[PDB]
């Protein structure tokens, strides 16, 4: 009965990354440290509010921070990073282990410039306690009011009136 | 030797999965706005 | 059940995978999780005869999520009208549905 | 999906019709029972994969387990039937009426 | 019974190996210290997104960032 | 569709090969060459008669052990669970139960054939 | 390739129909094998590999024993193929024709709701998780070893006690 | 269609005699087909021809029963104008029993069936009139 | 059978129904029914004769189909609602198919043709278990879903069971078939009321068990399987005729014995819902159920038949067979009507 | 280009079958103090083609007692399965990357049995049926051990994918962890394929060429090359599983070459074993492969369940 609301085309028109998957797997560990605040805000909204239509702007901020990130990587440390992801994209499951020497070049570049340290083994696999000006969503799931249960008979129970009302048994 | 090797494999897996975790948000955002685009297109055609 | 020996001892031998919104092995939601949860949370405390008509909206939404018949009807109607119009020559499909779009990412 | 569930239910009904409507042999009846098992398996599996209910996916393996045990004891009874009468036919089993 | 096992190691050594390996499989998990790291490693693997948490203002031990000091340091998995 | 294609290719190879084997050669058919072998002499009866099998109990328990395989086979996925003690105990119990059944059959002479 | 699943389901129906007509257990076992193959293929079409492979394996290992038995017990001089009986051949042809006519009938009295010849292949998979890992069939079955360990014990008891039952029936 | 058999009560007895007549005939034919399927599955015939003959005899017999029943009821309700009177149904049941003992050569079957079917049809009318809901929904 | 095997088999028989009760999943319910199926066949086929093979094959082949039909009902419910429990707002066809298969499992008419045959093909024990303990889980299914069953076929099947059990036991000289048709009739009385206060269904079940078990013991004490064999009981063990008489007259429900309580209170709760003429028919065919019991107890207790010369050897020797529970179960039947309000 | 890939996977396997026949004959010869074929070619490198051509020029036998449908269809199925088994084989990069390759192999072989088992029935005769029932007994014997062996071995690999064994064996072989499972796997590959000493279906001195006594021409040839293809497949499986060669992502042809070497060694070992030993009995095979192999197999499965845990060596799911 109720119409679905949806955003317009221009409420989704966005400057996209246009960037592939090995180029992106290479810079994953640095994109998880830098550009973590926006990403975690977007995640919290997307899971707290179960609607995409209520978080487009956080997604747009995510895309913006990613673009700024790769702009830093382009204006600084483009050749070693190029070599890294080019050698990474050769594999079939895109394994870091086969390209372990170009990591060194990329990391030393991105460390001597901008001081970006690679996260260690299990730092991107844990909860991270974001804040925001947003409020809590009151009643997600758009739940209706619950019907009231049937009341309990309050009383100290007594013997049955005249025992069993069965047919002719007295007691 | 197998013990130690699978031990390292369970660390390379941690690395790969952590990259997946770092890039989940971008894919989620793009998935969302792509689905919404497709639905708005379906709607704008169903209207006519 | 007949002999609630599980409730007697607090164990759950079988009464924890009774439906879809119930502890998938790793936390992957089954489809209609929300609908079934909402139906079940309406039909609690109540039993049966009263839940079947005080929690009907939520069951109907669940039934449409799982079996999903009215959406089939809707898309079938849209398709039938589109085929009629294209046969008459009235409709002109766009590029983003003939197979020629600008992919978004 | 509704198409294939309809077809699978009709397949169950055919195998049930089979195992009800007897012929001479009994092995064919046991095979019809196996076919009913198989159709039920596929129904359960498809419902579980559609709904993404990985909690119920241990159900069809249980179906196969118990159906195969059923087949086992049926085949043992068939061994006994042959040792008695020699030829597997279900018409020779007509002495409990008297 | 030592003589019985001496006889069985000559005649039917296949079942002796079998019972020995069965008992060994059952007893050795109880012995090792590495037995407990298995569940911990299976737990450490993040197959699903760690969903962030709202800052109530009363979450000291919870970190504000991935590479903060807090949280489970997975360096026990390194140099195990 | 790659796999479907490989299998269709192998299928058509086999069928083209049989077509060649049948329609390329020459034929001289007659009843004395098309009747069953039985080593120079003629058969005394049909081959579509009972062949008593003397390992039927072994066949049935093979079926049950096949189901045991089907139950054991999820272990590579069961090991990446967090518990790693319930699965251990339960797999131990399953294998030990199967071994107990095998031992009972063995001692009761079910693995021996019906002479 | 949109009618794939409908073709597979129809083939399975025909296999079970030729089964229900009950030729000798040789051709009945052939039908079981073909139908289990088709079942595996559709269980794969719906996104499940393990369950289909295991149907195939179990039914193959079972029809092996059925061959071993039916050579001994359910054998005749003339094993009665489908063509052996004009009446069986007629009911088989009539069953194919009847199911075809029935499908063409229920595609009329209801536009859609039971069968959709028009939209076919459009309703198979129902909300896949487009981004995922550790999601296949096999995790759910491996839950027999954790979170559903009563199925495992009850199945194991069935098999174990079935061994004793076998020995006693055969003795 | 349930409405077909519910047409028996759109109007009282004495009216629409042919309608009610061959309704009851159809009902008897259905019951006879059931009895015939059971007598052909259990205690089967020596040949398919005799099986068909069994079906035909049983079905035509029960059809004649129902036809005589409906005729007699609507006639004895048209005559002696009294729809709310189970004696019409009694006379119809007796006519049915008579046809049973005629198709099946037996006077004792005729009398036994007359009494039993007549009382049954009388009770049927009495219950349709006073509201006896066999197979009732649970109320307490 | 060696002891390990008996332990395994009787544990399985006990655990089939126990799994069936203490299970909310219908599939583990099915599992329990299949344990009851699998474990019964060894002891049915223990004496290894053609009669036993036929009985076991008939039992197996009739119960497998019912099991598959129940599994179909369960899988259709899972498709419909994504759960493993027959809720309300399920399909009446699913529920009715479940009812049909459960009736085939119990032995109700018109699915009754196998029970007397199978029962004649097996010893007195394995008739007791088959008629008492195997009936308890299949009944548990219906008891757990009583407000979902259609109140029409539930009663047609009951009425058919009543009529056919009475008429079949009218002419059976074999006692192992009399017990079977008695089972059919009593399951009819149960199933008739099962949508109406299913506590009474369990009442009739307990009464029926308490009556049949000692009767089977009575048959066991001399391996009596025929009217002519039970008639030679005024010579062999004549201290049992009193209890046999009162137990038969409780089975065919006569007032002063407690076997009239279930029929009486069933008629009560059926007249409380305007199910009048059905109850009348049932109460009037229970008389024919009583007639052959009366014939039997004439034959054994009131009109002592001719005996043999070789029956004096039995008088020379001594006995040990009455298990001390025959007394308790025969006296708690036949004499517990005044305690009926505590039973209800 | 996928069809060219099919060619490069299928035609060389058939030449390999054809020249394995030659290698068998010549190795058995030299073990038997004689020279095998050295006439028809320089060193007899044309005898396989001669045999094939001569077999496809002979008149096929369509008997009267036979069931022609199953008769013609069984060799078709035999070769089709023998040739589809080579599909997921990583050598190192496969043609078809499946996630459950070993289950595909297992099911395909358990179906390959039915070629023998239907050809024997369809060929209405006595020795034919003897061969069929012996195949039934053989499969009953070996299938359980094959599956549980393979389970125990992949219980340190972490998956049913064949390609993951290459990374499981990047620094070692699975033969030193599991040489007993390797022994039993080898002898079950020897029971599978109906290869001596576990031949027992074309046992020329017990049966007169069981399940082929009524087959003459290209059908018999199809059975032949199916057998000699499954031999190389099983050697390829043993050397992918246990004798893991070197991957070296830059040098994959090195993997292919070492795979070739090990597969040839293990196939020549099959021929060696044919030459050396006498035949088992098809009840002695049961007694062996139930009363010696299955106890130790279950015990070592228990061991290999415990071992990832008490060593903290649980493998990864991809
Ligand atoms: C004996 C010596 C051992 C010591 C005895 C103890 C003496 C004592 O002081 O306490 C006795 C005890 C308590 O006495 P009280 O507390 O001073 O007075 C309380 C009233 O008597 C209150 O008593 P009541 O009248 O309320 O009775 C309670 C109960 C009655 O419960 C009963 O005890 C039943 C008595 C049998 C009648 O139910 C009833 O109200 C009467 C219903 C009777 C139902 C009968 C229906 C079946 C018809 C008969 C069938 C034939 C028998 C079975 C078939 C036989 C063939 C196999 O009462 C008795 O035991 C006397 C029994 C009276 C028999 C009623 C005859 C009718
Ligand atoms: C009423 C049911 C009547 C069924 C007709 C049974 C019959 O034909 O009698 C056997 C008759 C055969 O004559 P017989 O050879 O002299 O009997 C040998 C005795 O078993 C010889 O027995 P014995 O030598 O071992 O010793 C005599 C025996 C004699 O006792 C008996 O064998 C039967 C006594 C039952 C009396 C029931 C009368 C009704 C009482 C209403 C309450 O025991 C007694 O002295 C009786 C003690 C006091 C009565 C104990 C009964 C307690 C159960 C109460 C049930 C009440 C149900 C009503 O025929
Ligand atoms: C089979 C799977 C179940 C599918 C339903 C059955 C549909 C096929 C039935 C056709 C009738 C066959 C028959 O009557 O028996 C004849 C034959 C027996 O042959 P025969 O013994 O009568 O010899 C005939 C002799 N000539 C050739 C001279 C006439 O049996 C079969 O056909 C069964 C074989 C499988 C049929 C399926 C073929 C699929 C094609 C793949 C290639
Ligand atoms: C209810 C209607 C009953 C109509 C009876 C038709 C006769 C028939 O074929 O059914 C009996 C048949 C048993 O076959 P049989 O006893 O051998 O009869 C002699 C055949 N030579 O039964 C069977 O063989 C099983 C047939 C199952 C039907 C499957 C096909 C359904 C589609 C038509
Ligand atoms: C919904 C619509 C319901 C309509 C109700 C129709 C009423 C049908 C009456 C019952 C059929 C009995 C037919 C019969 O007469 O039994 C014959 C059969 C033995 O055959 P035979 O002796 O040769 O025939 C003698 C002719 N009286 O005797 C038998 O084999 C016994 C078969 C009895 C089964 C009757 C069960 C009917 C009720 C089932 C409810 C479900
Ligand atoms: C004379 C007639 C003889 C006929 C002989 C027929 C030979 C059949 C060969 C045996 C096949 C049995 C095994 C079943 C096929 C393999 C199933 C499988 O696991 O792989 C199927 C594959 C996807 O499966 P998976 O690897 O798990 O998923 C990959 C995700 N990236 O991809 C698929 O899902 C599609 C698989 C289609 C299988 C085609 C079967 C062809 C049947 C034609 C007949």
mmCIF file of C-alpha atoms in Angstrom, chain I residues 84-240:
data_model
loop_
_atom_site.group_PDB
_atom_site.id
_atom_site.type_symbol
_atom_site.label_atom_id
_atom_site.label_comp_id
_atom_site.label_asym_id
_atom_site.label_seq_id
_atom_site.Cartn_x
_atom_site.Cartn_y
_atom_site.Cartn_z
ATOM 1 C CA UNK I 84 10.270 -27.056 11.898
ATOM 2 C CA UNK I 85 6.936 -26.962 13.708
ATOM 3 C CA UNK I 86 3.322 -27.197 12.596
ATOM 4 C CA UNK I 87 2.082 -23.755 13.526
ATOM 5 C CA UNK I 88 -1.379 -22.456 12.945
ATOM 6 C CA UNK I 89 -1.812 -20.929 9.463
ATOM 7 C CA UNK I 90 -0.386 -24.082 7.905
ATOM 8 C CA UNK I 91 -2.072 -25.876 5.020
ATOM 9 C CA UNK I 92 -4.843 -28.298 5.852
ATOM 10 C CA UNK I 93 -3.527 -30.614 3.168
ATOM 11 C CA UNK I 94 -0.180 -30.859 4.952
ATOM 12 C CA UNK I 95 -1.912 -31.480 8.261
ATOM 13 C CA UNK I 96 -4.297 -34.046 6.794
ATOM 14 C CA UNK I 97 -1.478 -35.933 5.074
ATOM 15 C CA UNK I 98 0.307 -36.032 8.418
ATOM 16 C CA UNK I 99 -2.879 -37.391 9.979
ATOM 17 C CA UNK I 100 -3.260 -40.038 7.267
ATOM 18 C CA UNK I 101 0.306 -41.256 7.664
ATOM 19 C CA UNK I 102 0.012 -41.298 11.442
ATOM 20 C CA UNK I 103 -3.159 -43.370 11.107
ATOM 21 C CA UNK I 104 -1.271 -45.782 8.864
ATOM 22 C CA UNK I 105 1.398 -45.958 11.580
ATOM 23 C CA UNK I 106 -1.063 -46.605 14.416
ATOM 24 C CA UNK I 107 -3.185 -49.095 12.477
ATOM 25 C CA UNK I 108 -6.479 -47.265 12.173
ATOM 26 C CA UNK I 109 -9.066 -48.204 9.628
ATOM 27 C CA UNK I 110 -9.056 -48.009 6.590
ATOM 28 C CA UNK I 111 -5.298 -48.446 7.162
ATOM 29 C CA UNK I 112 -5.876 -51.410 9.465
ATOM 30 C CA UNK I 113 -5.348 -54.339 7.101
ATOM 31 C CA UNK I 114 -1.755 -54.964 8.223
ATOM 32 C CA UNK I 115 -2.050 -54.948 12.012
ATOM 33 C CA UNK I 116 -3.876 -58.278 12.613
ATOM 34 C CA UNK I 117 -1.713 -60.027 10.024
ATOM 35 C CA UNK I 118 1.553 -58.746 11.493
ATOM 36 C CA UNK I 119 0.332 -59.494 15.003
ATOM 37 C CA UNK I 120 -0.510 -63.092 14.122
ATOM 38 C CA UNK I 121 2.908 -63.451 12.528
ATOM 39 C CA UNK I 122 4.836 -62.720 15.730
ATOM 40 C CA UNK I 123 4.954 -64.024 19.306
ATOM 41 C CA UNK I 124 2.853 -62.742 22.191
ATOM 42 C CA UNK I 125 5.656 -60.438 23.146
ATOM 43 C CA UNK I 126 6.294 -58.181 20.154
ATOM 44 C CA UNK I 127 2.505 -58.058 20.026
ATOM 45 C CA UNK I 128 2.479 -56.363 23.400
ATOM 46 C CA UNK I 129 5.167 -53.849 22.445
ATOM 47 C CA UNK I 130 3.713 -53.395 18.966
ATOM 48 C CA UNK I 131 0.238 -52.661 20.327
ATOM 49 C CA UNK I 132 1.194 -50.613 23.402
ATOM 50 C CA UNK I 133 4.562 -48.876 23.126
ATOM 51 C CA UNK I 134 4.674 -48.225 19.386
ATOM 52 C CA UNK I 135 1.329 -46.400 19.664
ATOM 53 C CA UNK I 136 2.655 -43.763 22.063
ATOM 54 C CA UNK I 137 4.870 -41.552 19.897
ATOM 55 C CA UNK I 138 2.552 -41.485 16.859
ATOM 56 C CA UNK I 139 -0.162 -40.428 19.284
ATOM 57 C CA UNK I 140 2.207 -37.838 20.747
ATOM 58 C CA UNK I 141 2.408 -36.169 17.337
ATOM 59 C CA UNK I 142 -1.348 -35.697 17.183
ATOM 60 C CA UNK I 143 -1.547 -34.635 20.827
ATOM 61 C CA UNK I 144 0.995 -31.897 20.166
ATOM 62 C CA UNK I 145 -1.044 -30.529 17.215
ATOM 63 C CA UNK I 146 -4.610 -31.159 18.341
ATOM 64 C CA UNK I 147 -6.028 -27.643 17.608
ATOM 65 C CA UNK I 148 -4.876 -27.868 13.975
ATOM 66 C CA UNK I 149 -6.585 -31.075 12.863
ATOM 67 C CA UNK I 150 -9.736 -31.153 10.792
ATOM 68 C CA UNK I 151 -12.562 -32.458 12.973
ATOM 69 C CA UNK I 152 -14.128 -34.450 10.108
ATOM 70 C CA UNK I 153 -11.719 -37.109 8.871
ATOM 71 C CA UNK I 154 -10.536 -37.413 12.479
ATOM 72 C CA UNK I 155 -14.042 -38.742 13.209
ATOM 73 C CA UNK I 156 -14.649 -40.678 9.993
ATOM 74 C CA UNK I 157 -11.454 -42.635 10.629
ATOM 75 C CA UNK I 158 -12.491 -43.242 14.227
ATOM 76 C CA UNK I 159 -15.909 -44.483 13.161
ATOM 77 C CA UNK I 160 -14.404 -46.759 10.515
ATOM 78 C CA UNK I 161 -11.946 -48.125 13.080
ATOM 79 C CA UNK I 162 -14.784 -48.799 15.534
ATOM 80 C CA UNK I 163 -16.988 -50.557 12.987
ATOM 81 C CA UNK I 164 -14.234 -52.568 11.326
ATOM 82 C CA UNK I 165 -12.578 -53.631 14.560
ATOM 83 C CA UNK I 166 -15.892 -54.838 15.932
ATOM 84 C CA UNK I 167 -16.801 -56.704 12.757
ATOM 85 C CA UNK I 168 -13.339 -58.213 12.372
ATOM 86 C CA UNK I 169 -13.112 -59.428 15.936
ATOM 87 C CA UNK I 170 -16.599 -60.882 15.640
ATOM 88 C CA UNK I 171 -15.264 -63.854 13.666
ATOM 89 C CA UNK I 172 -11.612 -64.285 14.687
ATOM 90 C CA UNK I 173 -10.842 -67.571 16.418
ATOM 91 C CA UNK I 174 -7.226 -66.464 16.728
ATOM 92 C CA UNK I 175 -6.537 -64.375 19.801
ATOM 93 C CA UNK I 176 -3.580 -62.467 18.351
ATOM 94 C CA UNK I 177 -6.031 -60.919 15.872
ATOM 95 C CA UNK I 178 -8.672 -60.228 18.512
ATOM 96 C CA UNK I 179 -6.105 -58.099 20.319
ATOM 97 C CA UNK I 180 -5.323 -56.299 17.066
ATOM 98 C CA UNK I 181 -8.931 -55.425 16.301
ATOM 99 C CA UNK I 182 -9.313 -54.315 19.918
ATOM 100 C CA UNK I 183 -6.357 -51.999 19.336
ATOM 101 C CA UNK I 184 -8.061 -50.647 16.230
ATOM 102 C CA UNK I 185 -11.300 -49.932 18.083
ATOM 103 C CA UNK I 186 -9.592 -48.278 21.048
ATOM 104 C CA UNK I 187 -7.409 -46.106 18.828
ATOM 105 C CA UNK I 188 -10.673 -45.111 17.191
ATOM 106 C CA UNK I 189 -12.119 -44.012 20.525
ATOM 107 C CA UNK I 190 -8.902 -42.091 21.205
ATOM 108 C CA UNK I 191 -8.661 -40.349 17.852
ATOM 109 C CA UNK I 192 -12.317 -39.343 17.969
ATOM 110 C CA UNK I 193 -11.762 -37.202 21.056
ATOM 111 C CA UNK I 194 -8.173 -36.098 20.317
ATOM 112 C CA UNK I 195 -9.291 -32.629 19.093
ATOM 113 C CA UNK I 196 -11.458 -32.439 22.238
ATOM 114 C CA UNK I 197 -9.513 -32.560 25.511
ATOM 115 C CA UNK I 198 -6.617 -34.850 24.526
ATOM 116 C CA UNK I 199 -6.083 -35.764 28.177
ATOM 117 C CA UNK I 200 -8.844 -38.312 27.641
ATOM 118 C CA UNK I 201 -6.939 -39.807 24.723
ATOM 119 C CA UNK I 202 -4.052 -40.507 27.080
ATOM 120 C CA UNK I 203 -6.534 -41.838 29.637
ATOM 121 C CA UNK I 204 -7.925 -44.360 27.162
ATOM 122 C CA UNK I 205 -4.364 -45.189 26.128
ATOM 123 C CA UNK I 206 -3.262 -45.961 29.681
ATOM 124 C CA UNK I 207 -6.423 -47.961 30.388
ATOM 125 C CA UNK I 208 -5.962 -49.909 27.156
ATOM 126 C CA UNK I 209 -2.325 -50.696 27.932
ATOM 127 C CA UNK I 210 -3.123 -51.743 31.490
ATOM 128 C CA UNK I 211 -5.775 -54.098 30.118
ATOM 129 C CA UNK I 212 -3.828 -55.554 27.197
ATOM 130 C CA UNK I 213 -0.477 -56.207 28.875
ATOM 131 C CA UNK I 214 -1.846 -58.657 31.483
ATOM 132 C CA UNK I 215 -4.049 -60.255 28.839
ATOM 133 C CA UNK I 216 -0.945 -60.901 26.759
ATOM 134 C CA UNK I 217 0.695 -62.336 29.876
ATOM 135 C CA UNK I 218 -2.295 -64.647 30.319
ATOM 136 C CA UNK I 219 -1.824 -65.860 26.761
ATOM 137 C CA UNK I 220 1.907 -66.199 27.439
ATOM 138 C CA UNK I 221 1.509 -68.387 30.508
ATOM 139 C CA UNK I 222 0.499 -71.378 28.366
ATOM 140 C CA UNK I 223 1.281 -69.919 24.911
ATOM 141 C CA UNK I 224 -2.418 -69.710 24.166
ATOM 142 C CA UNK I 225 -3.153 -68.366 20.693
ATOM 143 C CA UNK I 226 -6.616 -69.778 19.964
ATOM 144 C CA UNK I 227 -10.036 -70.097 21.581
ATOM 145 C CA UNK I 228 -9.447 -73.820 21.943
ATOM 146 C CA UNK I 229 -6.093 -73.269 23.654
ATOM 147 C CA UNK I 230 -7.408 -70.650 26.078
ATOM 148 C CA UNK I 231 -10.332 -72.999 26.743
ATOM 149 C CA UNK I 232 -7.924 -75.548 28.269
ATOM 150 C CA UNK I 233 -7.316 -73.214 31.184
ATOM 151 C CA UNK I 234 -9.756 -74.640 33.729
ATOM 152 C CA UNK I 235 -7.198 -77.475 33.988
ATOM 153 C CA UNK I 236 -3.779 -75.911 33.502
ATOM 154 C CA UNK I 237 -3.933 -72.640 35.470
ATOM 155 C CA UNK I 238 -7.525 -72.153 36.639
ATOM 156 C CA UNK I 239 -6.785 -69.360 39.127
ATOM 157 C CA UNK I 240 -6.658 -66.869 36.233
#
